[PDB]
Amino acid sequence: GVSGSCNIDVVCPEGDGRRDIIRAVGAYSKSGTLACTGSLVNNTANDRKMYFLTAHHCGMGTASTAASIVVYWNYQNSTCRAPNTPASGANGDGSMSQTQSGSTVKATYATSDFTLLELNNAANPAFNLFWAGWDRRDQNYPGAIAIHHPNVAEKRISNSTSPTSFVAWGGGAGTTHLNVQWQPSGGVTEPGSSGSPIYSPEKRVLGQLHGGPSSCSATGTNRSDQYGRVFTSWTGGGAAASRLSDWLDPASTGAQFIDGLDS
């Protein structure tokens, strides 16, 4: 696929130290057409349930649309294309043949923009998936890591080395979203990246992409994006079908954060 040349291939050196969480992320189609990103999350039972977090605005939070999903795992360029060079902006060589179809909706909620799906098929060991940890604490972080499929193309990594802040969707005063400031010549996010995770420096999911003003040509504070927060989604709409808690901490352990689980 094709995306902005400022984006960074996951196989580049920026992916070192993150080779586990890169494997939690997948691209997917809705009703046959490539649409958004989502990723696997661990739960306190550590049982590999196929909980796949994505964005509510992608439209998968209904039985019918959820049933139509096709996930594409390991879809990424085979070689690191130098960022900010025409090679990075060129059609990539990723393979789309490691796939699984079908899911059911566990919860969806418009305010923090999340949808939690459960994929129908258990993890195929050949895919070497990873279920990432999460952190539901009410705080900010000194930086963050995005793993995404911009334009639903080959997987990319974007780094933030600036503190996060709290905003309402659209950037106003509020606490439902995390505002993430991209590096001035670093990777950003693009349409199709929607639903992709943001991780803390410790590699735990903090939210999923809602959208924002970023682009490879954006400058200053416009080179940013907003993620619906796991803290907000945790209590969500007030019932199991609109929040994360029942699914992510089924064992009712009271965990504020957990680490990932490998395949």
Swiss-Prot record:
- Judging by the UniProt lineage, the source's domain of life is Bacteria
Tell where it localizes: Secreted
Q: How is it modified after translation?
A: Three disulfide bonds are present.
| Catalytic residue list | H57, D113, S194
List S-S links within the chain.
C6-C216, C12-C80, C36-C58
| Family to which the UniProt record says this protein belongs | Belongs to the peptidase S1 family.
Fill in the domain comment.
The C-terminal extension has little effect on the function of API.
Official protein name in the record: Protease 1
